[PDB]
Amino acid sequence: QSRSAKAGLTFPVGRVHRLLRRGNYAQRIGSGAPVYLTAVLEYLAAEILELAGNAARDNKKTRIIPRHLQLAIRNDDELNKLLGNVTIAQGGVLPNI
DNA sequence: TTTAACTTTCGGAAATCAAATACACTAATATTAAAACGCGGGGGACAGCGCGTACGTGCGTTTAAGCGGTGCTAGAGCTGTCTACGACCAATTGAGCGGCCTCGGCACCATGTGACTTAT
């Protein structure tokens, strides 16, 4: 058995734990912190990737592309607050009317 | 063949339990600095306009941009190996403010000897 396996999360929480270790965020790394934040990250990735799926459906290209990613993330009004100053590579910009 | 997760522990952390302040607010109070009603105003900001203008709008001949070979070498990234350098321990200090003391100087009772005296 593995900690990354029993976590039931895609991203390996062991990697997150040791990243927190070398990241100097504190002297001890609470074992629930990496798994919790890994799950939060996985949900946010799920948001981006269900947007990817429906953008692939809308644009008829089965595999998601950065244009679709930029368009969907810029249409995500609440998420743009998190990613306001953020910008995406090769994504262009959403059309202004 | 190399990035992990078992573990096998343990000694600082992060809970707990507690009382010591102490601070916030919920609140009376007459005052009283600013609010907010209330009418003109200037002043200005927008309606409407002429015609000048300035950036597109449109052709000719250029120019660079883009490839497309032709090296070649400067670093990429990696050093395999020697320290240095800093993280730990501790000693190696120290200074500052209480502690004892201990200086010498007073007031007071003890002790011996020089008068002298007397009854030896």
Q: Are A94 and A70 in contact (CB under 8 A)?
A: yes
Q: Is residue A76 part of a domain?
A: yes
Residue at A93 is within a domain: no
Task: Write the CA distances from A58 to A41, A51, A64, integer angstroms.
Answer: 25, 10, 11
Are the C-beta atoms of A54 and A43 separated by less than 8 Å?
no
Rounded distance in angstroms from the CA atom of residue A57 to the C1' atom of nucleotide B12: 56
Residue span of the structural domain in which A37 resides: 1-86
Q: Which nucleotide is nearest to A18 (CA to C1')?
A: B4
Query: Determination technique for this PDB entry?
Result: cryo-EM
A78 lies in some domain: yes
Instruction: Indicate whether A91 belongs to any domain.
Output: no
A31: left (phi over 0), alpha (psi -120 to 50) or beta: alpha
- Cα-Cα-Cα-Cα dihedral sign, residues A42, A48, A49, A50: positive
Residue A26, phi-psi category: left (phi > 0), alpha (psi -120 to 50), beta (remainder) = beta
Is residue A15 included in any domain, yes or no?
Answer: yes
CATH number at residue A77: 1.10.20.10
- Angle value at C-alpha A13, between A69 and A8, nearest 5 degrees: 85
With respect to residue A92, please indicate whether it lies within any of the assigned structural domains. Answer: no
Distance, Å, A96 CA → B99 C1': 87
- How many domains, in total, are found in chain A? 1
User: Which positions in strand B are less than 7 Å from the protein's CB atoms?
Assistant: 3-6, 13-14
Q: How far apart are CA A10 and CA A48, in angstroms?
A: 15
